[PDB]
Amino acid sequence: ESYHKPDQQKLQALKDTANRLRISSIQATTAAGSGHPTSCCSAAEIMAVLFFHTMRYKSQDPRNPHNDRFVLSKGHAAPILYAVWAEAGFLAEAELLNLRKISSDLDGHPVPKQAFTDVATGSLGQGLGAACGMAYTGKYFDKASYRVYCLLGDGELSQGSVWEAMAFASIYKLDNLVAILDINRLGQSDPAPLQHQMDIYQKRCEAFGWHAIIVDGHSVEELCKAFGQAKHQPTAIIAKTFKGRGITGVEDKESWHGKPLPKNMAEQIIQEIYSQIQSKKKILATPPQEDAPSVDIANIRMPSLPSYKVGDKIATRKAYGQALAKLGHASDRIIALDGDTKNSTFSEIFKKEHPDRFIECYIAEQNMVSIAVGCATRNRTVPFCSTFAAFFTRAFDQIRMAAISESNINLCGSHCGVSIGEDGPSQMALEDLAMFRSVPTSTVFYPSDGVATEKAVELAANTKGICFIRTSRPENAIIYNNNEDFQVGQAKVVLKSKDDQVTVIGAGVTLHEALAAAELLKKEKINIRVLDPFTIKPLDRKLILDSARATKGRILTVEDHYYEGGIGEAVSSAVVGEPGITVTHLAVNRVPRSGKPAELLKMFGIDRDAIAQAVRGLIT
Amino acid sequence: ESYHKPDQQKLQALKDTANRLRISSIQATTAAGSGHPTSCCSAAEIMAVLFFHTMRYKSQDPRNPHNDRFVLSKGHAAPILYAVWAEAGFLAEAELLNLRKISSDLDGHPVPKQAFTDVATGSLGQGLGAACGMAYTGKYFDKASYRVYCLLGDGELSQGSVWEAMAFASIYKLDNLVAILDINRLGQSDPAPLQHQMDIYQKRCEAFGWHAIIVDGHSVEELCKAFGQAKHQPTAIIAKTFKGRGITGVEDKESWHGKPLPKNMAEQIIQEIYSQIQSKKKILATPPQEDAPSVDIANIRMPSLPSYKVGDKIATRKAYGQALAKLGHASDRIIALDGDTKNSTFSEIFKKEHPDRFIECYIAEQNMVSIAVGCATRNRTVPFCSTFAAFFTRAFDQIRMAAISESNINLCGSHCGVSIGEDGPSQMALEDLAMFRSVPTSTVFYPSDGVATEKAVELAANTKGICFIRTSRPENAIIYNNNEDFQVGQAKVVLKSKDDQVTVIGAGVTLHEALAAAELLKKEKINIRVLDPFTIKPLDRKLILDSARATKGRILTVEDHYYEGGIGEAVSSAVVGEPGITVTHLAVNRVPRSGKPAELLKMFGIDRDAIAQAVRGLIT
């Protein structure tokens, strides 16, 4: 469709719109007593032109799948986002004045309780990665005409995650993606490093494969023109702006970031801005081409039961890849992402079978998580991203923000614990249960054999929120029948007798060590009950307690994880105060070191012999 | 000092050295049965030239403060690092064959139990940030002649953290820093994105402010020459290499990352490499100029007691800045780092008083943590880095690796919990206690007033490991006398009576809410004991239990944090099984939202009224 070259009246209306957006940003933040009007004002022309000339969207249906996407990466400019959606007719204008109130959903930074927000922002440097996922989805999955626009701050460009996204977009030729850089010179507490050295921003963008255009970010005409030309590459509109533009005496000054105008000043400034507005008549949004496809919403089911055999040996990391590939044959919604570890996590199996739905994210875990979040928006795909669980610590802020974004993503982290052996602690996940348990929307699966792994993959696919699956390197025996029923929050008793003296809770390699301990102890005429949690969060408190009551109240937890935040603490917190119940923990007490898997389980006190000794100690 | 232009014999000796390093890397990884010989072999000439022509260091004293630093950012090339230190005469050559054994310290990736390792690597993309801290320290603090060399992989350059470090080095004019990029074309599971497009690497480095030189990374002469010219900017030596260089049939091939050669193949290949070596005679290291200054090692003491007054109001975030500035007058070892939040964390106070020892790190928390780790190496400084606690989640992998690095850094995270109010959840730290408690070397301080904050700063300065101080936004009353003695692991009972019915444990704003609850309850003739942990890790289990035993066994924890991994779980895990002890928790159950601080404490069930109701419930 042809560019509509605006006449002077349309240009003036865009200026009038920009100034209305300034006024609202000031009014709202002065009413609240907090917020970031100067960060809004540098972006006012950008916002006016995007929403009232360039973008195509249904103003009354912001989540519509055919719409262009807008991502406010500099989320503290929320008041101007709210203002455009009022200008577009979706929000009531009076509601803007309720910014930041407990009685409003116009919160301090954008959040998905707002129909016009897909991802929460507020932690800087994450929006472009989400936008890349949206754009990748648009070009390669939806195969639709929508475009994706992401507005970033200049201080924000100091985040490495932004540059991961830049690189991703050029690798994947996201010519439906536009990044708008609000180069307003200043950060929060000092000038941004490059200030108004526009040429250096251009060189950095070009070196990362983008088409880069420097503009006057306060010229509505230059913005219309620059946004009106599609390219064959991701495009960076590098906008020279002034922080607090239009606020006389504040424009281009330090000491104003995140400071509202006092009421007396707001009144005077608003009168001046209003004097520049030529007409009250608002521009209307223009609707999109409706070419996004339908997506099915039904539950996704494995095409058959697991086909393992009891006694066969397989590492849960390999079972994950097998199960994910299997699930991919059941539904085209499943996509897989991995950060140059596909041969070790076994997501390569999925790539072999379903290459068009695998996204290689390279060694950039922060961006990988953001891509997944973007791909999941508007329920367009069901993503499974994988790496070593240790390296999900590199993406914790993205995971944290994903929960604030109410995102439905699945994350599988392999190589947990000391049982990986020789690579040593840099590769050992020993804090991932702590990390993922702290994510409020999380479900944490810790499958102990191949059957449980396949069931965890299936359950995760159909579970909302942040699903984490912890996989392991050692080959361990299949212990479950492949028709064993598995559910979130339901544990399994895998060994019992009427004369059990301790309930031992293990998972993954420590479940198998507990079973080996039981065999050692039978020689001493000591029986133990062995319990496999299946999910660490939520925890089957009832079965744990019922088990403990059959074993003299005694629970022993054993885990290939640090003491804090893991299985032992979860269990302790669940049962504390219950009469006659005791909980004893075995876990890894310090940074480990290289050795064979069995040697490290021994050294760190979580193998069969440590378990047996702890049991004997409890009995006496 | 003049470049010594090598003769053909010295060049041949450097080639011979490179080939010896290949042989050792193969031998060691074949002996271990695991490791990354192909990743070693691409770097062999680089390593030979750095260690035996360019660098200046004491071969028998790798930690010597006058030495040039080398950082192996691509840590999986550990076997070649070990091999150079054997070649230099520090390690016994026989020991190289014990790679990855539980009986050896030649672990899978480098770790600081090795004298020649300052920081652990293995999580890719972190070494350059550490190197930047070392170089900044060398140029601006030590004011010494040592240089810093950091070897990176090409896949590794996909990490955003690398680009943060690139930008930092040019901002701070680190002309004593050299990054060597091993552009061997291949990552772990596919070619690296840019493969051998050397010009694009050059453009990216130049756009980020570095002097960039493309070389044949297998030419010892080109390497000598390129390393021999100092510059006025940080310098990137962009080395075109082949993965598995020198291994016939493996060089430049996929499917070989992290795969050792089988013994039959290793023998054949080693014979071929050995046939290329002209002389067995080894080159000797050359020693450094000894111009690094002495650094004092004594305990650092505040110059006077805190000067607060009981009843005065101050936010602990502001007390942190005051206390840090105060401590800076006591010792020149203290340095402060912050990520464009100095006005909000109050580290700006330190910057005002001690500007030469403040490092602005901009909006790049991952790199900030790495800079701090680098600055702490060899005990050259005592760093305190600050941001909002929420944004330390962006740096969790750096923090995790800092503990593996046995680093002594101090981290202060502000803006904890819902009590910040209107900014909303993106800015609210609700998982930081979980995160930092899971770090094995951590001490977690949660000061509840200005006095406790100043004491926490002082204690942290003198405590090894990863020290975290959690600060808060609300002004709360000073409750402690300024001569109150504080110690790690020692809690305080701040309200008691003989007829106390519940021990209520709070911290920060919830300690003050608990005190307000006690006042509400006295009206009902209910007294509660109130306990302030001071440190969450380690936890004063004895005082908690002694308190509980005076209050009918009943403990109530209340925290401005999520349920998992926080104060409630720490307490529960400490006391579980103790006869007659019960623990009830109040915490934040889901992602919050914007409102006034008091409104959010109410909504999320952690204010004075929630506490009072929970207490009444326990009594009945």
Ligand SMILES: Cc1ncc(C[n+]2c([C@](O)(CO)[C@@H](O)[C@H](O)[C@H](O)COP(=O)(O)O)sc(CCOP(=O)(O)OP(=O)(O)O)c2C)c(N)n1
């Ligand atoms: C990952 C990360 N790191 C730092 C920040 C902090 N930050 C931000 C906030 O947290 C807001 O999201 C703070 O402003 C915050 O609201 C106030 O400090 C609270 O003040 P107080 O009254 O509580 O004292 S914004 C910011 C500077 C961004 O500079 P830019 O140049 O990117 O954007 P702009 O010039 O505004 O267009 C910076 C640096 C962030 N949001 N995300």
Ligand SMILES: Cc1ncc(C[n+]2c([C@](O)(CO)[C@@H](O)[C@H](O)[C@H](O)COP(=O)(O)O)sc(CCOP(=O)(O)OP(=O)(O)O)c2C)c(N)n1
């Ligand atoms: C933050 C981060 N992300 C991914 C990695 C993984 N990674 C690594 C390791 O974890 C080693 O540190 C793995 O190799 C690991 O040892 C094996 O996967 C274990 O195999 P398995 O036998 O257990 O199956 S190395 C690596 C590729 C690095 O490619 P580069 O091009 O940077 O270096 P190079 O070509 O080797 O000079 C990549 C991608 C990392 N170390 N750090």
Ligand SMILES: [Ca+2]
């Ligand atoms: Ca800015």
Ligand SMILES: [Ca+2]
């Ligand atoms: Ca490589």
Ligand code: NA
């Ligand atoms: Na899911």
Ligand code: NA
């Ligand atoms: Na310390």
